[PDB]
C-alpha cells in the first residue's frame, strides 16, 4: 500500500521472511562454530565443541526483538 | 496480475529445472498436467 499498483505487481519475486524457529536455532551454531574452526585449521589447531558448550549459547544469543 | 505469478511460479518452475540436469533434452515435447495432488506437475523424458 506504500507504492502504486503499478509497481507492487511488476515484481517477479516477493520473498517474505519469517521469524527464528525454535527447531532451526540448532543449525545457526553449527556454522558459526565452523568458521572459527576452518581460521584456526591454518595453524595445524583444531577446536572441538560438545553438546554442553552449545546449550548455554542457544538460551543466550537469541532475542525476538534483535535476532543474530 | 496474479495470473502472472502463477506461471512463473509453478509452470515455469519445474520445467526449467530439468533443462539443466538432463531432464527435457532439446528436441523432445514435453507434457504438462496434473497430478494427484492438485499442482502442475512436469511428466520428465529422460533421466540425470
Given amino acids: 500500500r506504500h507504492f502504486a499498483n503499478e509497481f507492487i505487481n511488476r515484481i517477479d519475486e516477493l520473498i517474505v521472511f519469517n521469524r527464528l524457529t525454535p527447531s532451526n536455532i540448532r543449525k545457526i551454531v553449527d556454522v558459526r562454530l565452523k568458521e572459527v574452526q576452518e581460521r584456526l585449521d591454518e595453524k595445524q589447531i583444531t577446536l572441538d565443541v560438545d553438546d554442553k558448550a552449545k546449550d548455554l549459547l542457544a538460551q543466550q544469543g537469541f532475542d525476538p526483538v534483535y535476532g543474530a | ?48
Avoid at chain 2, 495470473?3 to 523432445?28: F, K, M, Y
Wanted: proline letters at 4%; glycine letters at 10%; zero cysteines.
Fill in chain 2, 1 to 48: 496480475r496474479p495470473l502472472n505469478r502463477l506461471i512463473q511460479h509453478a509452470l515455469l518452475t519445474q520445467l526449467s529445472r530439468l533443462l539443466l540436469d538432463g531432464g527435457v533434452r532439446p528436441g523432445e515435447i514435453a507434457k504438462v498436467t496434473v497430478d494427484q495432488e492438485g499442482e502442475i506437475i512436469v511428466i520428465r523424458n529422460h533421466g540425470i
